[PDB]
């Protein structure tokens, strides 16, 4: 299947409390593998997955130097934006960035992207052509004109198509035992009373990897997608994932509803009853 390398960056100002909080978090697929946090006692880029032990000390030194440089650029950005939006120095503000690339099972590039937000709203983004930018407001249009005259897109494209892809392949190779594994979901159904002669049926899926899964409830061969409550698939603390899906059904009629679990670790989908 496909794979991704993604870097989530966040800078948060805190007036009266010193410099902004700055964080970078890297993911290969849905697994955290590196992180930088400016609030650490000695801020360094650090491994977050076991297989990153295969990188030498030069790797960590280089990533740490990038992070400290990036941190400074976002401090300046935070100042600049107060001018752009005529905001006071007293309020806290947030920059977010997502950068990444995705490859097929053969290692070839599928797509690359970079998108930015200010205070939780789109600011500027690289278009799918990887040549032009798209800006959400007047402030972002200033930024766009700057990046165009500096040729920033060309530099970014070279990273997304070359460096990003090549390192993703390396991490997939180095982290093969972790990243290319499949852990099959284990499923069960719980039952809870409600008022008015109705019952909540909840189907659980536990201990699975990778994160992509489908949980559906059925009554007589039709899916009850519109009547389901769900949680977003969520990490379980040990590198695996879990999810649940519920439906409200008439008391006494529980036996007619079935939960269906689809996952790459399930040659045939699971079918469960209460």
């Amino acid at each position: 299947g496909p794979h991704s390398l993604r870097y989530f960056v966040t800078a948060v100002s805190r007036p009266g409390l010193g410099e902004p909080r700055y964080m970078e978090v890297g993911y290969v697929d849905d697994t955290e593998f590196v992180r930088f946090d400016s609030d650490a006692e000695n801020p360094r880029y650090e491994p977050r997955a076991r297989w990153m032990e295969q990188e030498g000390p030069e790797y960590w030194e280089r990533e740490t130097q990038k992070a400290k440089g990036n941190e400074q650029s976002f401090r300046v950005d935070l100042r600049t934006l107060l001018g752009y939006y005529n905001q006071s120095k007293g309020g806290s503000h947030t920059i977010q960035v997502i950068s990444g690339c995705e490859v097929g099972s053969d290692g070839r590039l599928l797509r690359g992207y970079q998108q930015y937000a200010y205070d939780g709203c789109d600011y500027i983004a690289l278009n799918e052509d990887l040549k032009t930018w798209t800006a959400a407001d007047m402030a972002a249009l200033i930024t766009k004109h700057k990046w165009e005259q500096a040729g920033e897109a060309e530099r970014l494209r070279a990273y997304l198509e070359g460096t990003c892809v090549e390192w993703l392949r390396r991490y997939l190779k180095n982290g093969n035992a972790t990243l290319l594994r499949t852990d099959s979901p284990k499923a069960h159904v719980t039952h809870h009373s409600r008022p008015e002669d109705k019952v909540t049926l909840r189907c659980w899926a536990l201990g699975f990897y990778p994160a992509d899964i489908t949980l559906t409830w059925q009554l007589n061969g039709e899916e009850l997608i519109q009547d389901m409550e769900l949680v977003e698939t969520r990490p379980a603390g040990d590198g695996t994932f879990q999810k649940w899906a519920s439906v409200v059904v008439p008391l006494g009629k529980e036996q007619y509803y079935t939960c269906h679990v689809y996952h790459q670790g399930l040659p045939e989908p699971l079918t469960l009853r209460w």
Partner: peptide
């Protein structure tokens, strides 16, 4: 391998 340059806004 993280992006090493985010251009100033």
């Amino acid at each position: 391998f993280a992006p090493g340059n985010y251009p100033a806004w």
